């Protein structure tokens, strides 16, 4: 069962009530580039899954359960307090993400929140290298047909040397090193079975990766509502069985005549109440970003060529655009 009354397990967090939807900054914040990193310790997926066996999340709010589906979620926000790598807006991104999901009544069975902000209601643990890795394995490990997964990262993205690649920096990166995108892809995407939907939001400043995903679409300045966009194949081969959807920000691909963009994109998308298609919704989001003086335009990437005429959702399997090979 899912907890449906506030008396079941007692009082649950009202994140909207704490002002996390409308009373926090939804403006860009500055992300200073971390710079080149030494080579990371590569992920041992077996150890990751081993270390994930004891772990659980909690139900963050009551909502109406979706029949035949369970929802699990992992949220990671890192402000790197006290360091030269300090960021002002990453844990705040998680705040808005959490409030937006609540406001929309996404019925999450178990959530894990890894933030470095003190006294953050519902904080599970610190976003260390070992916690990010093991909780990533936690998120995907019990995935059965019908399951819905949600992943959110706000923090530094950077490049690191190989023994270059894109990588994200845990709060303890100084001591434990970064995590390469190859390993994130292997943990979070590669192990999903068929008929499992995942949405992953990566809000990391500069490193606008798409995590080795085969399909992408960038909603650049020249796209119009009265156009018909399609995803493109940008990588040969595919190791992802499940339905993975990734939201991130990149530089405009239109030829010309930092922090918080990916989070505004997915929150604006969700807060739009009118059941728009991926395509129409991305135009509106692109306009919102330009309005609020974001550097980035929205980028949708996926493990299949999504028909962008399909309605946007967090819970549904993809309708495939057969015209994309
Ligand atoms: Sm890579």
UniProtKB/Swiss-Prot annotation:
What keywords appear on the UniProt entry?
Autocatalytic cleavage, Calcium, Endosome, Hydrolase, Metal-binding, Protease, Thiol protease, Zymogen
Residues the record marks as site: Cleavage: 53-54
Q: Cellular location of this protein?
A: Recycling endosome
Outcome, altering residue 204 to G: Severe loss of catalytic activity
Q: Where is this site: Important for Arg/Lys-specific substrate specificity?
A: 93, 203
One GO term of the biological process aspect = proteolysis
Query: What InterPro entries has UniProt attached to this entry?
Result: Caspase-like_dom_sf, Metacaspase, Pept_C14_caspase
Give the quaternary structure.
Monomer.
Q: What is known of its domains?
A: There are 2 calcium binding sites with high and low affinity, respectively.
> What name does the UniProt record give this protein?
Metacaspase-2
Encoded by which gene?
A: MCA2
């Amino acid at each position: 069962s899912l907890i449906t009354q506030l008396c079941d397990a007692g009082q649950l967090a009202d994140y909207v009530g704490l002002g996390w939807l409308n009373a926090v900054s939804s403006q860009p914040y500055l992300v200073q580039a971390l710079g080149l990193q030494p080579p990371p310790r590569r992920v041992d997926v077996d150890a990751a899954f081993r270390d994930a066996k004891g772990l659980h999340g909690h139900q963050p709010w009551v909502a109406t359960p979706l029949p035949g589906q369970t929802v699990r979620a992992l949220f990671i926000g890192i402000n790197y307090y006290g360091t030269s790598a300090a960021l002002s807006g990453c844990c705040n991104d998680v705040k808005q993400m959490l409030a937006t999901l609540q406001k929309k009544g996404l019925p999450i069975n178990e959530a894990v929140i890894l933030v470095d902000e003190d006294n953050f209601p519902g904080r599970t643990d610190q976003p260390t290298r070992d916690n990010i890795v093991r909780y990533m394995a936690w998120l995907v490990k019990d995935a059965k047909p019908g399951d819905v997964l949600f992943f959110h990262y706000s923090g530094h993205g950077t490049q690191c040397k190989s023994r270059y690649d894109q990588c994200i920096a845990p709060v303890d990166f100084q001591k434990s090193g970064c995590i390469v995108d190859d390993d994130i892809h292997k943990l979070l995407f590669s192990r999903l079975p068929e008929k499992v939907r995942l949405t992953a939001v990566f809000d990391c400043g500069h490193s606008g990766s798409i995590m080795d995903l085969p399909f992408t679409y960038v909603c650049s300045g020249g796209e119009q509502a009265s156009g018909t966009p399609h995803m493109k194949r940008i990588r040969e081969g595919n190791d992802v069985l499940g339905d993975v959807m990734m939201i991130s920000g990149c530089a405009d691909e239109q030829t010309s005549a930092a922090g918080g963009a990916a989070t505004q994109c997915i929150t604006c998308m969700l807060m739009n109440n009118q059941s728009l298609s991926y395509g129409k919704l991305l135009i509106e989001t692109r306009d919102m970003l330009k309005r609020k003086r974001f550097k980035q335009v929205p980028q949708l990437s996926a493990s299949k060529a999504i028909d962008l005429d399909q309605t946007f959702s967090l819970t549904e399997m993809f309708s495939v655009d057969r015209s994309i090979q």
